[PDB]
Design a protein around this ligand. Structure first.
Ligand code: MQ9
Ligand code: SF4
Ligand code: SF4
Ligand code: SF4
Lengths: 183, 122, 395, 189, 125, 406, 117
């Protein structure tokens, strides 16, 4: 959008900060949930907690209105195409919260049927441990995503950030090479 | 002209607001082409092959068609009440009786439709 | 005397009437923001929650945050949509929503910058039906949005919107008849003036109830909510819409809620007249206080909307149409007769007879409707017959 | 659009009630006609509009143009013969004057509109209303058919789910590798 | 001839090194020289694909923040006339998803140099 | 014929629980054919069980039909114990706590069913009030087990640990408040005109249909048949409890909803009985060859093996150390054999076919989950009605897709 | 007849009762004392690590979420009493299911589970 054509002066910085504040608030989750993690997501929406306090009570039934896709449960092989379709049918900017161990790495179900982490099919922004994560853990992960969204760049700043993140990522060794103290 | 130009001004404000809102929707925010994004939402399932049959290239029956047909006539008929209602005091008893006869005729029609199952289906 | 009063309307200079139009538009914008925020917080309270209380001080910016986010969100134009009508449907929904409010009396005459003008953008000889016409145009927004999306769920949502029109519009129209009979005019200002002695909510209670049900129906609000029907059609008509197009559909919905609540206030709650606890106060009905009273009444109606949403499930649209045609329309028509006969008798000195008929009529109707609620909807049925599946033995 | 524009013109011609009623009733009527278009023609069917009757299109256009031209010629200049301001009649209320005329000078036609409504309702009830001999079976009825709905071809196999294909038009794979007919609804191509 | 440009996407640098080892400067002396563009993040890979000028993309299905299969589906849905996509799968059972990603070819981990080279030749031929 | 659309209720839909795929042929908006699409939540739990020991597959089974964790755990543990021939050796306190937790879990699962059904049918506040009650229930569950869901608290031969000292008081408070707070939820729905109109006569399924599809639970008992595995084929000592099998004769969605609402009160009564009969004692079989050796206790460093157990195994008891090591690492060995054990889960007969090949891992564990069988009634309870009626019918079926796919 | 409206009386009533929401994150709610929070490796009062690297926690983990490598407590560098200590100890919290089998498995109480989440 034209907000991405703005010059990199103070104008772009203020547009970025206001857009981040606006998007961190009103972060409507998609009406999407796979398993017991979906039950904990509902509990988070439930009175004991209040997802609504964060402007996130409107679980967008359609992906068009959804801004955040809380996977919230295990993703089977047959479901990955559906989850990717839902992700693609959301409109940018989009974010994916991998709620629970099943959504983030497959969790305990390390077998043929489970995808072993939704990042196999959709870009994940935050991983949320737990099986299921208790609602406070979900709110913590959501606030972490809010912090990430606030510092989200735009336009030329976005391009520079992408280049810098690429440069940093090209150098990190794989986890299999962090042999610290391994005999 | 008077008593309406305020309506015209408010309509101009609202139309400018709405068209500019559509323009902002199309022009502000990210835009990235994606065939999966643009295709019809079907609860995550692949949309039916384009073709045309049994829907878009076909018809969607409404089961309250009868009530729609009745709605046309009843809506156009009730509007007689408005001038009658406003001028009620000035018209006098004759107009009251005339409108009561008209309303009883409408009631006969309504009762025939209702009791013969016309208000059934949706 | 004659309403709209020619001594008050049609004399605002171009700048003053432009200022009033802009003020009404800004008032509707602020009222929509407040309606959304207050609805979310009141739903929270009615559900033991707090609602938005983090985005800005006490969550005051939550509605603005959502609006700007929708602005900052990608404007989708899905393939397979009838692009021209698909892009127009939001505008068709929005424009009538604002237009209808042009004839709402927010207050009485007031002097601003040396000009005596009504605290009201304008008034018409047929203002109430002008509001009805504008709202009726607005529904084409919903229906064409559902149809133009080129998808099953939006199509079903638009079809439900059309069914809802069939269900509620005739009842809405018939509700105005008693109001006109007692006020003798279609101008909103004239209707407000006619309620100086007493508010029509007490005099025309059946009309008020039918109108209120039709209000909730017209605004696509729970427990009717049919065109959206989140639990049934995902997003209903506004599926396949994103960003400010969806934002404008919802803005039109809320502006319609406000407009029709203000119309209810005008026609039944004495418009901007101060309530009884403040009516005795000198100057309450004069100056800018009428604006406060009108806003208070409108917001009581908004609270009724939110309360209905929190308490009631949503009807099937066939059930809503049955309510409209088997209950609302017959009740409103019987009430129109009863009222006409009553007023004619009173004008001819019949007196007691009217006081009898009216009561008897309502006594009958509340019974007959009860039958439809209890007798027609029988709660007993016969058992089914067995088949090849070798059913077990029942208790 | 045409109806709403004509309503605006009526308002401009000192007929406010008529214009507003136009908007209301024609909004309703065009909504119903749109419903019947979806029901009877098609949701998004694009008509060919190719002249099916040989030479009928040209003849119809010629006849229409000639009729319009002749009508306009017959109209000629009329307002040149005087144009009374309607303000005299609308004085005391346009709706008030309409009420005075309708229920005094034209009460007979007003009542006959009731006969028109009754005839329309009767036609709807006779031609369009279906009756017991063809009423759709209720969910209760369908469930109770030797337990047909759930036990007689117990809910039919879902459409097959394949990598790259999961739409309802995809048949499921039988063990022998052949596509199961029951998996895909018979209507689908 | 034009140096065929190949996009190698993997958060794991060792997977990129193995892919570049299997495919030398020339897969065969009959084929053109090969230039490799290494991308570790999905945003960079998507932007490079949008810039175009690639003859093949090797996407690691095991990439941590955004899997190769997801990126393959995204690029084939978002870039017009996108080059053939080769996906590296972390397990045999991923084959189904590899088919879903519509990748022209799938090579299981661990990356067999010869299998990868043959698949690349088939895709470029 | 050519005038009916075919649509996907699809996995991603508010009423389809995210993984259920109803494919509906709608003539206008009447469901003509209703195909059911399953497996979007298949997980391989049944196969993955085979590579973990007993007392470990518990953590797997609790995650299929995740709204009824204690029921899955109890079915699994009863199967293991029956294969061991140990069912009669389980401590009385363990059985009483099992019944108490199963009934509290029945209340919780019915609360979730009512919440999601009301949300699907527009009853917005129904979800919040149901989850408010479920919040107290889950507080009790968390205090007892340390987890809010997918508990692994019921273990082959007893429980994972004894109740905390405050557990009895919390459960008594639940017995006190649950009826009053369920009153709020019942007032929203029970007699509400819209709720009854939206569910009465919807999703009809006669007793013949229930038998033909093998339906069970509230759906079957909405036909008036008082079939309940707690009375017929009693387990965990349910025979010692005075409670009435809730059953209705409407055979529709509203009857099933009322059955669930009344089952909540029956569960409250059973929990009161459990508290009355709850007496101090061991919660795990006395046979040290099978008993779970862990002894969890709290301290300033958190929850962990009690210092007394640490002293016993690492300081003085070689046999104790060997038993702890082996029963924790390999686990018990279950004599070879097959056993089919069934319980009355909130959604019907939850059956478990358990086959042991004499090893330390379950050779085969299949869950006949009631939701899997009940979903076969979607065609019967949806065809003919409107999509709005289909939503109510499916919600009345109350399918938890974790149990459906497993 | 008013029974059908009972729901209204509910919601309105709750509108005047104090909301029951926990104030997380500003005022986090009280978790159960027994809650299965993050694993924690504990020390003896003198500072020695309790973990002897027996791998029983990892052994019992259903999700293979623990990796442990033992090593000798040489006199030059002792980390735990006895012959063995766990020099490498990793928990993959994206595989942890919080079951608590690990702590029940430990023979030293070196592994506990706190209430931190
Ligand atoms: C153009 C311009 C910028 C103009 C300037 C002015 C301006 C800024 C704008 C003017 C004002 C405007 C237009 C503002 C824009 C915002 C706007 C118009 C409106 C949007 C905000 C709005 C509508 C607010 C209220 C919405 C609302 C009432 C929200 C509450 C919804 C609720 C109750 C959500 C809770 C749902 C919930 C419990 C979620 C869980 C979903 C789950 C778990 C899914 C998966 C799942 C399901 C579904 C199960 O049920 C389930 C059951 C059993 C087992 C498993 C599962 C399972 O897996
Ligand atoms: S992470 Fe745990 S709670 Fe979440 S879906 Fe997987 S098994 Fe269920
Ligand atoms: S079981 Fe305890 S002592 Fe043994 S390796 Fe694990 S943490 Fe260390
Ligand atoms: S809580 Fe359970 S899954 Fe997590 S590390 Fe401990 S034993 Fe493993």
């Amino acid at each position: 959008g034209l907000e991405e054509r703005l010059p990199g002066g103070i104008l772009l910085s203020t547009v970025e900060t206001v857009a981040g504040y606006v998007r961190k608030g009103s972060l409507w989750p998609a009406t999407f949930g796979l398993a017991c993690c979906a039950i904990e997501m509902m509990s988070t929406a439930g009175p004991r907690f209040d997802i609504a306090r964060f402007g996130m009570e409107r679980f967008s039934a359609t992906p068009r209105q959804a801004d955040l896709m809380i996977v919230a449960g295990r993703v089977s092989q047959k479901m990955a195409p559906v989850l990717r379709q839902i992700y693609d049918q959301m409109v940018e900017p989009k974010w994916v919260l991998a709620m629970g161990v099943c959504a983030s790495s497959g969790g305990m179900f390390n077998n043929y049927a489970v995808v072993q982490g939704v990042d196999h099919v959709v870009p994940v922004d935050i991983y949320l441990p737990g099986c299921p994560p208790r609602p406070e853990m979900l709110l913590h992960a959501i606030l972490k995503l809010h912090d990430k969204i606030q510092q989200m760049p735009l336009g030329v700043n976005r391009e520079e950030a992408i280049r810098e993140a690429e440069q940093a990522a090209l150098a990190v060794p794989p986890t299999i090479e962090l042999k610290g103290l391994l005999r | 002209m008077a008593l309406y130009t305020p309506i015209l001004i408010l309509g101009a404000i609202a139309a400018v607001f709405a068209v500019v809102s559509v323009g902002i929707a199309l022009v502000i925010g990210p835009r990235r082409f994606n065939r999966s994004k643009l295709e019809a939402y079907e609860c995550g399932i692949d949309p039916l092959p384009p073709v045309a049959a049994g829907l878009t290239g076909q018809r969607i029956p409404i089961r309250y068609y009868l009530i729609a047909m009745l709605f046309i006539v009843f809506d156009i008929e009730i509007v007689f009440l408005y001038p009658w209602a406003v001028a009620f005091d000035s018209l006098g008893l004759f107009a009251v009786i005339e409108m009561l006869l008209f309303m009883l005729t409408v009631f006969v029609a309504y009762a025939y439709v209702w009791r013969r199952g016309g208000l059934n289906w949706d | 005397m004659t309403h709209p009063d020619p001594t008050l309307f049609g004399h605002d200079p171009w700048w003053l009437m432009l200022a009033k139009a802009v003020a009404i538009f800004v008032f509707l914008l602020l009222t929509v923001l407040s309606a959304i925020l207050i609805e979310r917080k009141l739903l929270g309270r009615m559900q033991m929650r707090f609602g938005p209380n983090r985005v800005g001080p006490a969550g005051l910016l939550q509605s603005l945050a959502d609006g700007i986010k929708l602005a900052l969100k990608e404007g989708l134009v899905p393939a397979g949509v009838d692009k021209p009508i698909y892009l127009l449907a939001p505008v068709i929904s929005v424009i009538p929503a604002f237009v209808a409010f042009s004839v709402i009396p927010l207050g009485g005459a007031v002097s601003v910058f040396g000009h005596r003008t009504p605290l009201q953008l304008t008034d018409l000889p047929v203002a109430v039906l002008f509001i009805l016409a504008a709202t009726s145009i607005g529904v084409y927004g919903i229906v064409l949005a559902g149809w133009a999306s080129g998808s099953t769920y939006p199509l079903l949502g638009g079809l439900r919107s059309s069914a809802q029109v069939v269900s509620y519009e005739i009842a809405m129209g018939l509700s105005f008849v008693a109001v006109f009979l007692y006020a003798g005019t279609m101008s909103t200002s004239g209707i407000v003036a006619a309620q100086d002695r007493t508010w029509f909510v007490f005099l025309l209670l059946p009309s008020f109830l039918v109108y209120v049900v039709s209000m909730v129906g017209e605004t696509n609000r729970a427990p009717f909510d049919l065109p959206e029907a989140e639990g049934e059609l995902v997003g209903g008509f506004h599926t396949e819409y994103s960003s400010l197009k969806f934002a404008m559909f919802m803005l039109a919905e809320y502006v319609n809620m406000t407009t029709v609540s203000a119309l209810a206030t005008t026609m039944f709650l004495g418009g901007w007249h101060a309530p009884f606890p403040f009516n005795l106060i000198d100057g309450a009905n004069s100056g800018w206080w009428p604006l406060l009273w009108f806003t208070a009444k409108v917001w009581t109606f908004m609270f009724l909307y939110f309360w209905l949403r929190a308490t009631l499930p949503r009807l099937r649209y066939d059930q809503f149409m049955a309510l409209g045609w088997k209950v609302l329309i017959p009740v409103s028509l019987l009430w129109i007769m009863v009222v006409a006969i009553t007023r004619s008798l009173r004008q001819h000195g019949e007196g007691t007879w009217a006081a009898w008929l009216l009561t008897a009529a309502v006594v009958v109707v509340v019974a007959l409707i009860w039958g439809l609620a209890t007798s027609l909807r029988r709660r007993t049925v016969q058992p089914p017959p067995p088949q090849s599946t070798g059913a077990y033995p029942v208790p | 659009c045409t109806m709403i524009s004509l309503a605006v013109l009526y308002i401009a011609q000192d007929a406010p009630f008529l214009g507003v009623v136009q908007i209301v009733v024609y909004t309703g009527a065009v909504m119903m006609l749109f419903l019947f278009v979806l029901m009877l023609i098609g949701v998004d069917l694009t008509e060919s509009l190719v002249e099916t009757i040989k030479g009928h299109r040209i003849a119809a256009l010629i006849a229409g143009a000639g009729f319009g031209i002749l009508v306009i010629a017959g109209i000629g200049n009329v307002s040149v013969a005087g144009f009374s301001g309607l303000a005299a009649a609308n004085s005391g209320g346009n709706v008030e004057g309409l009420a005075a005329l309708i229920f005094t000078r034209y009460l007979w036609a007003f009542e006959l509109t009731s006969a028109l409504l009754i005839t329309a309702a009767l036609g709807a009830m006779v031609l369009a209303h279906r009756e017991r001999f063809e009423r759709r079976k209720t969910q209760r009825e369908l469930a109770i058919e030797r337990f047909q709905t759930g036990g007689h071809p117990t809910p039919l196999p879902n459409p097959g789910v394949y990598a790259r294909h999961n739409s309802v038009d995809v048949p499921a794979r039988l063990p022998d590798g052949s596509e199961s007919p029951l998996s895909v609804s018979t209507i689908l191509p | 001839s034009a140096p065929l440009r190949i996009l190698v996407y993997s958060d794991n640098p060792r997977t990129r090194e193995q892919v570049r080892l299997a495919l030398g400067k020339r897969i065969h002396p009959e084929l053109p020289e090969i230039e490799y563009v290494d991308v570790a993040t999905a945003p960079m890979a998507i932007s490079q694909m949008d810039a175009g000028g690639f003859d093949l993309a090797i996407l690691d299905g095991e990439a941590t923040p955004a899997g190769g299969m997801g990126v393959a589906k995204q690029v084939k849905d978002e870039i017009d006339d996108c080059p053939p996509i080769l996906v590296l799968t972390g397990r045999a059972d991923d084959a189904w998803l590899a088919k879903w990603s519509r990748a022209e070819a799938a090579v299981p981990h661990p990356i067999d140099p010869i299998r990868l080279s043959d698949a690349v030749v088939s895709l470029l031929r | 014929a050519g005038e009916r659309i075919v649509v996907n209720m699809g996995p991603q839909h508010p009423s389809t629980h995210g993984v259920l795929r109803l494919i509906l042929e709608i003539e206008g908006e009447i469901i003509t054919e209703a195909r059911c699409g399953i497996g979007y939540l298949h997980t391989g739990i049944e196969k993955n069980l085979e590579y973990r020991n007993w007392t470990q597959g518990v953590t797997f089974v609790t995650r299929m039909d995740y709204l009824s964790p204690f029921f899955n755990e109890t079915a699994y543990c009863l199967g293991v114990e029956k294969l061991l021939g140990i069912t009669d050796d389980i401590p009385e306190r363990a059985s009483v706590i099992r019944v108490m937790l199963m009934e509290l879990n029945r209340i919780s699962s019915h609360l979730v069913a009512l919440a999601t059904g009301g949300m699907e049918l527009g009853a917005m506040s129904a979800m919040f009030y149901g989850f408010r009650e479920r919040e107290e229930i889950l507080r009790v569950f968390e205090s007892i087990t340390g987890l809010r869901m997918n508990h692994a608290y019921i273990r082959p031969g007893g429980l994972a640990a004894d109740l905390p000292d405050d557990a009895i008081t919390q459960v008594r408070r639940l017995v006190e408040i649950l009826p009053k707070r369920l009153k709020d939820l019942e007032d929203l729905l029970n007699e509400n005109y819209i709720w009854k109109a939206r569910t009465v006569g919807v999703g009809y399924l006669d007793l013949t249909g229930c038998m033909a599809l093998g339906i069970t639970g509230p759906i079957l008992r909405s036909t008036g048949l008082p079939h309940d595995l707690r009375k017929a084929q009693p387990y965990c000592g349910y025979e010692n409890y005075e409670f009435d099998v809730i059953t209705d004769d409407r055979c529709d969605s509203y009857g099933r909803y009322i059955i669930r609402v009344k089952e909540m009160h029956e569960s409250v009564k059973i929990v009161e009985q459990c508290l009355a009969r709850l007496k101090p004692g061991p919660v795990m079989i006395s046979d040290k060859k099978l008993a779970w050796p862990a002894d969890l206790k709290l301290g300033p460093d958190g929850l962990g093996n009690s210092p007394e157990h640490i002293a016993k195994i690492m300081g003085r008891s070689m046999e104790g150390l060997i038993h702890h090591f082996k029963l924790v690492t390999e686990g018990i060995r279950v004599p070879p054999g097959q056993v089919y054990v069934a319980v009355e889960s909130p959604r019907g007969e939850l059956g478990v076919h358990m086959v042991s090949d004499g090893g330390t891992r379950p050779y085969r564990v299949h869950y006949r989950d009631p939701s899997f069988t009940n979903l076969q009634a979607v065609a019967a309870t949806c065809e003919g009605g409107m999509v709005a009626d289909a939503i109510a019918a499916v919600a009345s079926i109350d399918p938890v897709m974790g149990g459906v796919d497993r | 007849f008013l029974d059908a409206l009972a729901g209204f009386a509910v919601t309105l009533g709750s509108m005047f009762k104090k909301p029951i929401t926990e104030g997380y994150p500003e005022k986090p709610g009280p978790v159960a004392p027994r809650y299965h929070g993050r694993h924690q490796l504990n020390r003896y009062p003198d500072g020695l690590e309790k973990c002897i690297g027996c791998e029983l926690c990892a052994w019992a983990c259903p999700a293979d979420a623990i990796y442990v490598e033992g090593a000798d407590n040489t006199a030059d560098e002792r980390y735990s009493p006895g012959e063995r200590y766990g020099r490498v100890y990793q928990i993959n919290y994206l595989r942890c299911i919080g079951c608590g089998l690990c702590i029940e498995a430990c023979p030293t109480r070196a592994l506990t589970m706190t209430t931190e989440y």
